[PDB]
Design a protein around this ligand. Structure first.
Ligand SMILES: Cc1cc2nc3c(=O)[nH]c(=O)nc-3n(C[C@H](O)[C@H](O)[C@H](O)COP(=O)(O)OP(=O)(O)OC[C@H]3O[C@@H](n4cnc5c(N)ncnc54)[C@H](O)[C@@H]3O)c2cc1C
Ligand SMILES: O=CCCc1ccc(-c2cc(F)ccc2C(F)(F)F)cc1
Length: 651
C-alpha cells in the first residue's frame, strides 16, 4: 500500500512501534493507543514523503506542510518524529540536494578510519549533522571493497557487483540518488561439465533438488535435534552435509541388500521347485512304463489295471501341471525383480560433481569453505532478506562510493597505524603510503573505525590501539569468520557466449577444487566475462600468476564454446582480496563457534577507563541482521552516525 509500503521499504512494521522507537518515545508507548496510531501514521507518512523523492532534503517544515489534517496541528510530535527519523538515517541519507544549507559552525571533531561505503555513509550523516569530519583512507581511491575496473568502454567490478532484492533495501534509494543502472539477473544458469558437455536440464533439476533436501536435513538436525557440538567442537555445515550424504548412501545400500535377498530367496524356491518336478517326471516316466506293459497284453483284471494306471497317470500330470504354473508365478516374479532393481548408488560420480557445484555456489555466497561455517548460525540473518530479484550494477558499483564522497574531506594514501583514546579525547596516527617517513597526528573527540575484520584480525596488528581493545572485543574478532572470494575479468573484442544468459557454470572435477572458476558472469556493455574463484580455491589461486589463471579460464571456455571460438583477451584483471593488505579477505561469515551475537559485540563502542564512549565501530562485520553486504555496510554507517551524534550533539 501507500504509507504501509513506506514502512516496509524502511524495514519497519507499519502497525507497531519498534523497540528502538519505544526507547525514544516512552511517553508514546506508555500513553493511549490512539496516540500510538497517530505516531505510526506520522512516521509512515514522513517516510513516504522522503522515499517518493529521495533526491531532495525533506525538512521538518516541508513535512509539516504536506501532512493532512489533523496531523499538521501536532507540530511538536511531527518534529519529534522527523528529528528521530533524520538522526537515525531513515530519511535524508545518501546523496540529495540540501534545502537548508549546512551551518558554518561545526560541533565536535570525528576521525573516520576507512573510506568504504560504511565510512562514507557515516561521514555524510555526521557532516549533515553539522560535525567536523575527516576520513583517512589508506588506498588511492574510495570505495574499499566496492572496486570497479574502468578502461575505455570496459567496466567490471572486482568487489561487490550484486544488489539483492529492492524491497526493504536502502540501496534502492541510493540507486535513485546516483542514477545507477541495475539489471535483474536472468535465472537460466546452464552448467557444463569439465569436458564441456552441457548438463541435461532434467539432471540439473534432480541434483538441485537433492542439494535443497540435504540443506533442509542439516537444518532439522541442528534446530530440532540439537546436533551442534561434535566431541566438544562446534559442528560445521560442511561436516553436517557430509554426514547426511553418508546416511543417504547407507540407506541406498541397505535397500540394495534387501532387494538381493528377495532375489536369492526367489531363486532358491525356483530351484527346489525344479527339483520337485524332476522327481515327479521320473515318477511319471516310471509309471508310464507300467501303462505300456499293461497295454501290451484281455480279461477283466488286466483291463481294470489299465483303467487304474490311466487314472493315476493323468492325476500325476495334474500334479505336474500344477507345479508348472507355480513355476511361472515364480519366474515372472524373478523377472520382475531383476528388472526393477532399486538405486545402485545415491550419487554417481558425475552426480556428485554437479552436487559439488551447488556447494561451490554456497561457498561463494558465504565467501568460505562449508567446513568453516556454523551449522546452527550460518544463515542466522535469513529472516531479514529483501524481497525481489537480485540485480547487478550494469555501469559499475563504484558509482555509489564515488558519489557518496562528494564534498567530504578525504585523505587518501593515508594508512592509520595507531589509535589512542582517553577519557579526554583521541589521537589517530597515520603514515603516508608514498613517503613512509611522513607521519600525521589527527586529534579528535571520537574515532569511527571501519577497518575490515580481516585488518582487525591481522597478526602482527596493522593498527595498534592504545589502550588495547578489551578482551570481549578481541575475542569476538578472533571468533568471527572472515572469508575470501576472487574474480577473473576477461575483456574480449567480440561476444562468443550466449548474450541472453547472464550466468553459466563450470562443474569442477574434484570436491577439493569445486570452487575453481565455477561460475561465469555476463553483465556488461562491453565483451567482458567474470569468473569466480570460491571456497578453498579462492585463497590458493592467489598464488598463481594472472597469466596461468587466465589460461585456465580460456581452457574452460574453449571446452564449452570451441577452440576456434575463444580469442585471446585484450585485457585481464585478477583480484587477490586475501593478499590485499587493506582488506585481507572479502567479507565476514558466521564461523563455527561464533554466532550473530559476535556481530553485536563488534558494533559496541569502547569507553575509556576511569566516562563517555570515544571509539566506535561500523563496517559489514558490525551489523548482525545484514552482514557481509554493501547495504549492511551502509546501514552500519547510518547507525554509528546516529549513535555518535546522540553522544556529542544530544537527542
Ligand atoms: C570480491 C567481493 C565480492 C563481493 N560481493 C558481494 C556483492 O556482490 N554484493 C554485496 O552487497 N556485497 C558483496 N561483497 C561485500 C561488500 O563489498 C562489503 O560488505 C562492503 O563493501 C564492505 O564495506 P565496509 O565499509 O564495511 O568496508 P571496506 O569497503 O573494506 O572499507 C574499509 C576501508 O578501510 C580502508 N583501510 C584499511 N586499512 C586501513 C588503514 N590502516 N588505514 C586507513 N584505512 C584503511 C580500506 O582501504 C577500505 O576503503 C563483496 C566483496 C568482495 C570483496
Ligand atoms: O559478489 C560478491 C557477493 C557478495 C554478496 C554477499 C551476500 C549476498 C546475499 C545476501 C543476502 F542477505 C541473501 C542472499 C545473498 C546471496 F544469495 F546473494 F548471496 C549477496 C552478495
Amino acid at each position: 500500500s501507500g504509507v504501509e509500503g513506506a514502512a516496509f521499504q524502511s524495514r519497519l512494521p507499519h502497525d507497531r512501534m519498534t523497540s528502538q522507537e519505544a526507547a525514544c518515545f516512552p511517553d508514546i508507548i506508555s500513553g493511549p493507543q490512539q496516540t500510538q496510531k497517530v505516531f505510526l501514521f506520522i512516521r509512515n507518512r514522513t517516510l513516504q514523503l522522503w522515499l517518493d523523492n529521495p533526491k531532495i532534503q525533506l525538512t521538518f517544515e516541508a513535512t509539516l506542510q504536506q501532512l493532512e489534517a489533523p496531523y499538521n496541528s501536532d507540530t511538536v510530535l511531527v518534529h519529534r518524529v522527523h528529528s528521530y527519523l533524520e538522526r537515525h538515517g531513515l530519511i535524508n541519507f545518501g546523496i540529495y540536494k540540501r534545502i537548508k544549507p549546512l551551518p558554518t559552525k561545526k560541533t565536535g571533531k570525528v576521525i573516520i578510519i576507512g573510506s568504504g561505503v560504511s565510512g562514507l555513509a557515516a561521514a555524510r550523516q555526521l557532516q549533515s549533522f553539522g560535525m567536523d569530519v575527516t576520513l583517512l583512507e589508506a588506498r588511492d581511491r574510495v570505495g574499499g571493497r566496492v572496486a570497479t575496473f574502468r578502461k575505455g568502454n570496459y567496466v567490471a567490478d572486482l568487489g561487490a557487483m550484486v544488489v539483492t532484492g529492492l524491497g526493504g533495501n536502502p540501496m534502492a534509494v541510493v540507486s535513485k540518488q546516483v542514477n545507477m543502472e541495475l539489471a535483474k539477473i536472468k535465472q537460466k544458469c546452464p552448467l557444463y561439465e569439465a569436458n564441456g558437455q552441457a548438463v541435461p536440464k532434467e539432471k540439473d533439476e534432480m541434483v538441485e533438488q537433492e542439494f535443497n533436501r540435504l540443506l533442509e536435513a542439516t537444518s532439522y538436525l541442528s534446530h530440532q535435534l540439537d546436533f551442534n557440538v561434535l566431541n566438544n567442537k562446534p559442528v560445521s555445515l560442511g561436516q553436517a552435509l557430509e554426514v547426511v550424504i553418508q546416511l543417504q548412501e547407507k540407506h541406498v545400500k541397505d535397500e540394495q541388500i534387501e532387494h538381493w535377498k528377495k532375489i536369492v530367496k526367489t531363486q532358491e524356491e525356483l530351484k527346489e521347485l525344479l527339483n520337485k518336478m524332476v522327481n515327479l517326471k521320473e515318477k511319471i516316466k516310471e509309471l508310464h512304463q507300467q501303462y505300456k506293459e499293461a497295454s501290451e497284453v484281455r480279461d477283466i483284471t488286466a483291463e481294470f489295471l489299465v483303467k487304474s494306471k490311466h487314472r493315476d497317470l493323468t492325476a500325476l500330470c495334474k500334479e505336474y501341471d500344477e507345479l508348472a504354473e507355480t513355476q511361472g508365478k515364480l519366474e515372472e516374479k524373478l523377472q520382475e525383480l531383476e528388472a526393477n532393481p532399486p538405486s545402485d548408488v545415491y550419487l554417481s560420480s558425475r552426480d556428485r560433481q554437479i552436487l559439488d557445484w551447488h556447494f561451490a555456489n554456497l561457498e561463494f555466497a558465504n565467501a568460505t569453505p562449508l567446513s568453516t561455517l556454523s551449522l546452527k548460525h550460518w544463515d542466522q540473518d535469513d529472516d531479514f532478506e529483501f524481497t525481489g530479484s537480485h540485480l547487478t550494477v550494469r555501469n559499475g558499483y563504484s558509482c555509489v562510493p564515488v558519489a557518496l564522497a562528494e564534498g567530504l574531506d578525504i585523505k587518501l594514501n593515508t594508512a592509520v597505524r595507531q589509535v589512542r583514546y582517553t577519557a579526554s579525547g583521541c589521537e589517530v596516527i597515520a603514515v603516508n603510503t608514498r613517503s613512509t617517513s611522513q607521519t600525521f597526528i589527527y586529534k579528535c573527540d571520537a574515532v569511527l573505525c571501519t577497518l575490515p575484520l580481516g585488518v582487525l584480525k591481522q597478526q602482527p596488528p596493522a593498527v595498534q590501539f592504545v589502550p588495547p581493545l578489551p578482551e570481549w572485543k578481541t575475542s569476538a574478532v578472533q571468533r568471527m569468520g572472515f572469508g575470501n572470494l576472487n574474480k577473473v575479468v576477461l575483456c574480449f573484442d567480440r561476444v562468443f557466449w550466449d548474450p541472453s544468459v547472464n550466468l553459466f557454470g563450470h562443474v569442477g572435477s574434484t570436491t577439493a577444487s569445486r570452487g575453481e572458476l565455477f561460475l561465469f558472469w555476463n553483465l556488461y556493455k562491453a565483451p567482458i566475462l567474470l569468473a569466480l574463484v570460491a571456497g578453498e580455491a579462492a585463497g590458493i589461486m592467489e598464488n598463481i600468476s594472472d597469466d596461468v589463471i587466465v589460461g585456465r579460464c580460456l581452457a574452460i571456455l574453449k571446452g564449452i564454446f570451441g577452440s576456434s571460438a575463444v580469442p585471446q583477451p585484450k585485457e585481464t584483471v585478477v583480484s587477490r582480496w586475501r593478499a590485499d593488505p587493506w582488506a585481507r579477505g572479502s567479507y565476514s561469515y558466521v564461523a563455527a563457534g561464533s554466532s550473530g551475537n559476535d556481530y553485536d559485540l563488534m558494533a559496541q563502542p569502547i569507553t575509556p577507563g576511569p566516562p563517555i564512549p570515544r571509539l566506535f565501530f561500523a563496517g559489514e562485520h558490525t551489523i548482525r541482521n545484514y552482514p557481509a553486504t554493501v547495504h549492511g555496510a551502509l546501514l552500519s554507517g547510518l547507525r554509528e552516525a546516529g549513535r555518535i551524534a546522540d553522544q556529542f550533539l544530544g537527542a
